[PDB]
């Protein structure tokens, strides 16, 4: 219809100076983009460092295996028991490649399953990968990529020095069976002349390896199993060392934390998707204006306070927790001063920012103390790890919950020796957390000066229960008033401008990360009044079938009530009874409903339809 859409071409090029940041200077000089980029770079470097420290032990074991095979017929292979998330783990092999080019120990070729449909293509990919790895470390066509040229090249170059030939198979399950068996027989035929080491990337278990390898193929295999750590362990490591770290100013809420952990633990064991979801949360939080650039460290917070414009005051006054700051003051002159004059609030702001930072630091410290107090208990109602206690104490007031009363019941029944051991371990862990990580942080001396005399009061309570039944309730109420009531408040008991740090917008993130096409199609095919906001298409119930609806909705509500095989003529008569041109409208609506995959035409039968839903 349009001059852009044609009947011959499928692609259209708009090349403007192509040879062989999208945003300009307007967005990059704004402070919120710089603080977002800085926070995301910090968090990404931290999670990358944690992944390297997780992988380095079995990486060193693989390098020791390859070098021990080099210091030495069947070929030595090494099944690397990785998880079900293969594109989460491929960078693992990448790091191993650099280690094999650290000591000049071996030559690395990565055989992907997509480039190995046949045996001929797999052999060409292997020889081309080894030769171009040689050409990259220090062009032939793919027609002359055979094992004869590889043996001539290896006799020409590396005989004078043994350099191993490592063949990495990252996706072992996705390979063809016959191509894999012929490739293993080819690599086992050439041993003695070319030193081959084979590693694998098996995801499921070793039973798949022993099932897909026959008797004659496994007769020439000397495999050794290596096990990498699991994906929920990596989730708990990332969630306890990065997202609950006190040195970042951006805090997630309880709802978004539960939503992201639900996506991980229920749908896919991918650290990559969790990281991109947290990045989208960080982006949608920081892109709320230049006033949201204050969610950083304290000196830069004071600088951005002294940098703010006029509308930033009017967008930090729109927060729903700013009104508990206004209504709770009995003054009037201060109300006039902070509502309009745009500078009295600019002077009152840094005390509120410092109160928010102190509240989050003391929240993390009291959460560490509470999870050491609760984790040693049997049956663990409040949660074993730190993250479920984080969700349960941010989502509501924890003392009003029945699970805290169940924890108090199961905790108050305990004898004095295990009780004093638990509280001594709790004080040791809390002071260890206070001096090992809190002290090098900015504005961390004030948090230690708040918590530590209270902790010494708890220590005198521990000595008082050492020298002593009725002191136990005194110690428990002292825990409740000194740790849980003042420093473990819910999100509604927060400091008044905590929306600058806590990200609570969950609906837009939930609808822009989790994708529901079928829900939108079903909603727009039941009632278009949800979308068009028209005043003749409204429905009290979603099956009333009002005649002035859009044309696809009537056809949907007509075939929705019938059975599997839909006759077309009574369909057309029903559409003519609800509402030349009407036959063309019915033909267009049937074509639109077939294009979306809701019905289809029958092949054995003429003038009927088969519906594809249920």
């Amino acid at each position: 219809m349009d001059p852009t859409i044609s009947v011959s071409k499928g692609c259209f090029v708009y090349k403007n100076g192509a040879t062989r940041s999208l945003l300009g200077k307007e967005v990059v000089q704004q402070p919120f983009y710089e603080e977002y980029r800085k926070a995301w770079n910090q968090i990404n470097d931290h999670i990358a460092d944690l992944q390297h420290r997780s992988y380095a032990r079995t990486l060193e074991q693989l390098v020791d295996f390859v070098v021990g095979q080099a210091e030495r017929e069947v070929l030595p292979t090494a099944a690397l028991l990785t998880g079900i998330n293969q594109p989460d783990h491929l960078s693992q092999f990448t790091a191993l490649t650099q280690r094999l080019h650290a000591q000049r120990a071996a030559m690395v070729c990565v055989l992907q399953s997509r480039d190995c449909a046949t045996l001929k293509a797999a052999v060409e990919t292997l020889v081309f990968g080894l030769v171009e790895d040689n050409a990259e470390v220090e062009r032939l066509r793919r027609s002359q990529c055979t094992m004869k040229q590889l043996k001539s090249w290896y006799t020409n170059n590396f005989d004078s020095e043994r350099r191993q030939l490592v063949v990495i198979l990252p996706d072992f399950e996705c390979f063809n069976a016959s191509v894999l068996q012929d490739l293993i027989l080819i690599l086992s035929a050439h041993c003695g002349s070319l030193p081959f080491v084979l590693v694998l990337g098996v995801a499921t278990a070793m039973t798949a390896v022993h099932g897909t390898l026959p008797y004659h193929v496994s007769s020439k295999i000397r495999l050794r199993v290596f096990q990498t750590q699991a994906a929920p362990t990596g989730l708990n490591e990332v969630l306890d060392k990065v997202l609950l770290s006190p040195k970042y100013a951006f805090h997630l809420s309880g709802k978004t934390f539960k939503f992201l952990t639900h996506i991980f633990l229920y749908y896919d064991f991918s650290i990559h998707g969790f990281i991109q979801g947290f990045k989208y949360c960080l982006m949608e939080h920081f892109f709320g204006g230049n006033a949201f650039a204050l969610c950083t460290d304290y000196s830069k917070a004071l600088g951005r306070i002294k940098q703010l414009t006029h509308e930033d005051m009017e967008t930090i006054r729109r927060l729903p927790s700013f009104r508990p700051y206004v209504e709770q003051i009995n003054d009037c002159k201060r109300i006039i001063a902070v509502l309009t004059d745009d500078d009295y609030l600019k002077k009152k702001l840094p005390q509120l920012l410092r109160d928010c930072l102190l509240h989050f630091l003391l929240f993390r410290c009291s959460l560490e103390f509470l999870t050491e107090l609760v984790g040693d208990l049997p049956r663990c109602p409040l949660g074993k790890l730190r993250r479920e206690l984080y969700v349960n104490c941010l989502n509501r007031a924890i003392i009003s919950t029945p699970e805290y009363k169940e924890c108090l019941q199961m905790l108050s029944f305990l004898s004095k020796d295990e009780f004093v051991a638990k509280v001594n371990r709790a004080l040791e862990r809390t002071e260890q957390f206070l001096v090992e990580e809190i002290a090098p942080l900015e504005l961390g001396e004030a948090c230690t000066a708040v918590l530590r005399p209270k902790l010494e009061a708890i220590r005198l309570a521990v000595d008082e229960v050492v020298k002593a039944g009725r002191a136990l309730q005194k110690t428990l109420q002292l825990i409740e008033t000194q740790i849980v009531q003042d420093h473990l408040r819910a999100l509604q008991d927060a400091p008044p401008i905590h929306e600058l740090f806590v990200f609570s917008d969950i609906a837009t993130v939930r609808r822009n990360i989790i994708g529901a096409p079928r829900a939108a199609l079903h909603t727009a095919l039941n009632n278009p009044h949800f979308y068009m906001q028209c005043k003749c298409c409204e429905l009290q119930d979603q099956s009333l079938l009002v005649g002035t609806l859009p044309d696809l909705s009537v056809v949907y509500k007509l075939h929705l009530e019938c059975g599997r095989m839909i006759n077309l003529f009574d369909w057309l008569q029903a559409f003519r009874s609800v509402v030349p041109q009407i036959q063309a409208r019915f033909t267009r609506a049937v074509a639109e409903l077939q294009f979306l995959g809701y019905i289809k035409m029958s092949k054995r039968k003429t003038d009927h339809a088969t519906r594809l839903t249920w």
């Binding site: 022993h210 099932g211 026959p214 008797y215």
Partner: protein, 90 residues
């Protein structure tokens, strides 16, 4: 093949008929499914069993021997135990 008159067989049917004997054999008592599956693969690669041309344990097959060759194999085998020779004749 003698009972079903040259019908196609499987790994599960032959393994069930073998485990009906192995539980009372008193010399092949505790052999798993893995070693029997590897022995079935060893029969499959020497072309004493041919495919009818799905998983490997449910693919149909054909016996590529006459019965006189098996009857002579029972006579020329060295150190054949008594239970296997009793099971072969009946």
């Amino acid at each position: 093949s003698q009972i079903y008159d040259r019908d196609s067989f499987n790994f599960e049917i032959i393994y069930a008929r073998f485990s009906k004997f192995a539980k009372v054999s008193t010399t092949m008592q505790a052999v798993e499914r893995s070693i029997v599956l590897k022995a079935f693969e060893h029969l499959r690669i020497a072309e004493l069993i041919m495919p009818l041309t799905v998983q490997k344990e449910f693919e149909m097959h054909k016996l590529a021997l006459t019965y006189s060759q098996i009857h002579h194999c029972m006579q020329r085998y060295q150190a054949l135990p008594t239970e296997v020779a009793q099971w072969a004749q009946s």
